[PDB]
Amino acid sequence: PQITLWQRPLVTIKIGGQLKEALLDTGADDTVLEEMSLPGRWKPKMIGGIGGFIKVRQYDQIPIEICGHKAIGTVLVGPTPTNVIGRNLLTQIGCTLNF
Amino acid sequence: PQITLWQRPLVTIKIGGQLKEALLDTGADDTVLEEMSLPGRWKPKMIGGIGGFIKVRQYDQIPIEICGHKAIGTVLVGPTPTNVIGRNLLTQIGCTLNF
Ligand SMILES: C=CCNC(=O)[C@@H](NC(=O)[C@@](O)(CCCN(Cc1ccc(-c2ccncc2)cc1)NC(=O)[C@@H](NC(=O)OC)C(C)(C)C)Cc1ccc(CC=C)cc1)C(C)C
Ligand SMILES: [Cl-]
Ligand SMILES: [Cl-]
Numbered sequence: 418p419q420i421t422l423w424q425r426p427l428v429t430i431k432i433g434g435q436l437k438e439a440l441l442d443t444g445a446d447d448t449v450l451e452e453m454s455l456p457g458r459w460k461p462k463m464i465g466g467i468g469g470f471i472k473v474r475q476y477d478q479i480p481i482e483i484c485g486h487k488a489i490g491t492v493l494v495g496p497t498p499t500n501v502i503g504r505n506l507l508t509q510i511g512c513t514l515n516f
Numbered sequence: 517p518q519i520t521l522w523q524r525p526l527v528t529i530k531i532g533g534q535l536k537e538a539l540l541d542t543g544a545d546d547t548v549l550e551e552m553s554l555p556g557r558w559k560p561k562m563i564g565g566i567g568g569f570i571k572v573r574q575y576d577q578i579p580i581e582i583c584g585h586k587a588i589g590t591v592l593v594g595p596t597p598t599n600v601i602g603r604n605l606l607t608q609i610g611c612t613l614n615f
């Protein structure tokens with residue numbers, strides 16, 4: 418699709434058996450989701466943005482589906498104020514900025 | 517241009533006659549720049565990021581070039597980890613997301 422930026426670019430994702438809404442975020446290195454359960458190994462991480470840092474759990478090799486596009490990547494889970502899809506997954510569905 | 521996301525989408529901007537680097541950030545409502553001088557009066561704003569909230573100075577109707585594309589709009593100034601160009605100016609230069 419072509420997604421306008423007049424509004425926040427929100428999409429549905431499918432992950433860990435769940436449907437969630439998330440923001441397509443070209444400014445984010447990483448994908449970060451609100452507290453949820455995911456299978457397999459994880460390790461702690463600090464990530465930073467405006468306002469400073471939060472501690473998250475890093476899960477690797479997680480299948481995700483975004484607008485019908487399947488991908489796999491790292492997902493961070495923790496007390497983020499909103500769900501964001503970061504560049505690490507945006508690349509995999511072939512998402513570009515255009516003007 | 518078409519910009520892929522394998523690296524951070526950093527571009528050159530020009531504001532107050534000076535070149536800076538800034539990040540094209542579809543996850544940001546607003547444009548926020550690191551401490552700098554701008555003309556005129558400002559108003560208070562609080563903005564929220566992943567880490568929590570900061571206070572910034574809001575300047576309106578500021579000319580700014582983004583990748584050579586001319587815009588004029590609201591620029592916030594405050595303690596951000598990077599210069600970020602948000603949707604308020606991305607829309608002025610005709611930016612969309614595509615996949
Ligand atoms: C650890 C590696 C580097 N860090 C990052 O890549 C992180 N990226 C972000 O925080 C960023 O892309 C911003 C994410 C989008 N965020 C998403 C977001 C949106 C709303 C909130 C929110 C909601 C309700 N209440 C409080 C906050 C929080 C985060 N929106 C905002 O922060 C914006 N806020 C808003 O647009 O407010 C609507 C704004 C920039 C104007 C503060 C902007 C950004 C981009 C790069 C860097 C590091 C660069 C040296 C820092 C910040 C995470 C998300 C991957
Ligand atoms: Cl990844
Ligand atoms: Cl590509």
Ligand SMILES: [Cl-]
Pocket residue numbers: 588589590604605
């Ligand atoms: Cl504006």
